[PDB]
Design a protein around this nucleic acid. Structure first.
Ligand SMILES: [Mg+2]
Ligand SMILES: [Mg+2]
Ligand SMILES: [Mg+2]
Ligand SMILES: [Mg+2]
Ligand SMILES: [Mg+2]
Ligand SMILES: [Mg+2]
Ligand SMILES: [Mg+2]
Ligand SMILES: [Mg+2]
Ligand SMILES: [Mg+2]
Ligand SMILES: [Mg+2]
Ligand SMILES: [Mg+2]
Ligand SMILES: [Mg+2]
Lengths: 63, 87, 117, 104, 52
RNA sequence: AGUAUGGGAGAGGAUGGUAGAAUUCCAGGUGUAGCGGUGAAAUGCGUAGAGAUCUGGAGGAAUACCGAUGGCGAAGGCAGCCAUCUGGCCUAAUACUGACGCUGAGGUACGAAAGCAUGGGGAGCAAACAGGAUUAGAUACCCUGGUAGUCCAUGCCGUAAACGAUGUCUACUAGCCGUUGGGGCCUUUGAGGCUUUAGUGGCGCAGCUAACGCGAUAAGUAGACCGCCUGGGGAGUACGGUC
């Protein structure tokens, strides 16, 4: 955040910069997650799947 | 709590040979010292179930060592139990 | 009556609705408007077009007090975050900065249950 | 006995008292026996966030070799004192005595 | 890694004030654990901010 | 198999304290209309003035980022920071006792969540329950409220797809690639490369298997002790007994 505007900065470029800053921050993902409750078993399963996928990606890259 | 000094005193008192640390008597004396020490803590914290397993392990080890000593030598076992007032 | 040199814009963006509030620094609200306030009764309340229209109508009222420099705080995940800022730029206000203010709990209260449908 | 590190914040208004404050505390430790290894005055500093509607505070660091009862007394005195705003007690193995960063 | 050396700690905080994962920095796990502990202590001592 | 002496890692356990983020409620300042929610609506909340915004308080519960085929624990399971009490594990070298061991019928200890007894607490969520919807019907799915419960202290209960669907202990049998905690060696421009241990993962020869697959963390080759099964229902139910 805190995207200050230059003297001649067009509004569109500032909007794009704010979009990029928000995307880098990742706040939207947390806000989406907070909507509903994830039970411990479901989150453990999701993390296991994510780890397996990451390891597969690393092995594919190394090849 | 028991410091290195107390342990050294116990070992010296029950040592049989010079530099002896592994004889049954020394091990039983050290275990008895620790078991007696832990009584105050377990009186203070009665729901610490995780450390009572270690306490029970010490008790079982003492029982095994005493049974071994009795089988090896009866007089030594009697003297050890008399000194420690165990049973 | 009051003359305010600089102002702040608040965007309560939601899936259902988008609310625009205009305030002056140190607090106090000068004017406000929402999608449902000017038509858009129903699902259109969520459309970004309603968001930009609401922002424009709010800005038009805000001009009455007299101000030329604005700051934007976007607080919500709803569609209309870009629409409101575009409208505020179009109406002629100078935006000093645009920031995000959406809250985040550090494991606070339990969120509601998931919707099975 | 045990080596502790104590970093404590005090209010600017009572700043003139700090010179006395530390002194008395040291005396109490020296009453039992103790040892005072480090004592650094970082000075007034702006806070990263307002503590009790206060934007600046004076930080002071101490390193001691004290007993349990003295530590408890120090904790109680810190808590009941109104001048100081928040303290931190960290047990340290061995004593560190050298020019500490952020000294000046 | 101690709470005192605020500069090194700042060399790993993010603009929002969050800790950066080891995957980006490339640091060792033990170093990361002490790094996070020092950040939390300094954050408690109002030397670095909790958030932005 | 065990003991003494130096070090190291860790959400292991018990007690107390304390920090920041957020939700709800309360009081106040600006301000005037709606807000909220759904696929769409409606119930509901609001001109004794809501929603939005700012300030100051109350209370309960849980610890974003770090966070990871990561860590610790016998299993159940353990996540902010600080102190006290305390269990186990890894690692180096010496010095000790000298088979002191393994398993284990009965027995005994601990044991998720739900539920029970007494006394507290109650933010959020939420069985039952009351309304609004959809439908042919709606005892549900969806929406608005909401009680027990979820939290604490002292006890009881002893059950889970309590799962790796794989009892414990011991010796041996190609290799390759990761990662966590240590030991040793070789370079150096201060971080890398090799080995050795104890964990934790992905492939894979021989061997085994009905097949799928397992494969030094065996479901391979052997030994010691225990538990269990004998077609599908009836039934983990009837009678007796213990709790
Ligand atoms: Mg056994
Ligand atoms: Mg049995
Ligand atoms: Mg019981
Ligand atoms: Mg409901
Ligand atoms: Mg308790
Ligand atoms: Mg069963
Ligand atoms: Mg389980
Ligand atoms: Mg399983
Ligand atoms: Mg089974
Ligand atoms: Mg086998
Ligand atoms: Mg039959
Ligand atoms: Mg029965």
């Amino acid at each position: 955040p805190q995207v200050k505007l230059k003297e001649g900065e067009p509004v569109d470029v500032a909007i794009r910069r704010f979009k990029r800053s928000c995307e880098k921050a990742g706040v939207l993902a947390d806000v989406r997650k907070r909507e509903f409750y994830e039970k411990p078993t479901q989150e453990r399963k999701r993390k296991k799947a994510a780890a397996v996928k990451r390891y597969q990606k690393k092995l594919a890259r190394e090849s | 709590a028991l410091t290195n000094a107390d342990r050294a005193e116990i070992i010296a008192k029950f040592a049989r040979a010079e530099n002896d640390t592994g004889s049954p008597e020394v091990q039983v004396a050290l275990l008895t010292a620790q078991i007696n020490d832990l009584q105050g803590h377990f009186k203070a914290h009665k729901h610490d179930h995780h450390s009572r397993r270690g306490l029970i392990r010490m008790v079982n080890q003492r029982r095994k060592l005493l049974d071994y000593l009795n089988g090896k030598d009866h007089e030594r076992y009697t003297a050890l139990i008399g000194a420690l007032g165990l049973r | 009556t009051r003359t305010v040199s600089e102002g702040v814009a608040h965007i309560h963006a939601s899936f259902n609705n988008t609310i625009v509030t205009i305030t002056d620094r140190q607090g106090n609200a000068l004017a406000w408007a929402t999608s449902g306030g000017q038509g858009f009764r129903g699902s259109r309340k969520s459309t970004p077009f309603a968001a930009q229209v609401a922002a424009e109508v709010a800005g038009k009222a805000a001009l009455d007090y007299g101000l030329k420099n604005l700051d934007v705080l976007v607080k919500g995940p709803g569609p209309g975050r870009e629409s409101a800022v575009r409208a505020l730029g179009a109406v002629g206000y100078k935006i000093n900065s645009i920031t995000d203010v959406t809250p985040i709990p550090h494991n606070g209260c339990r969120p509601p249950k998931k919707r099975r449908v | 006995m045990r080596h502790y590190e104590i970093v404590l914040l005090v209010h600017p208004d009572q700043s003139d008292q700090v010179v006395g404050m530390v002194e008395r505390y040291i005396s109490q430790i020296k009453e039992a026996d103790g040892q005072i290894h480090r004592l650094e005055d970082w000075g007034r500093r702006q806070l990263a966030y307002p503590i009790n509607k206060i934007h600046k505070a004076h930080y002071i660091l101490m390193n001691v070799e004290c007993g349990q009862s003295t530590l408890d007394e120090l904790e109680e005195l810190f808590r009941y004192n109104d001048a100081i705003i928040r303290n931190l007690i960290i047990r340290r193995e061995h004593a560190i005595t050298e020019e500490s960063l952020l000294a000046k | 890694i101690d709470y005192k050396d605020i500069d090194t700690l700042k060399q790993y905080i993010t603009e929002n004030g969050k800790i950066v994962p080891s995957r980006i920095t490339g640091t060792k796990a033990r170093y990361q654990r002490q790094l996070a502990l020092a950040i939390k202590q300094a954050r408690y001592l109002s030397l670095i901010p909790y958030t932005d």
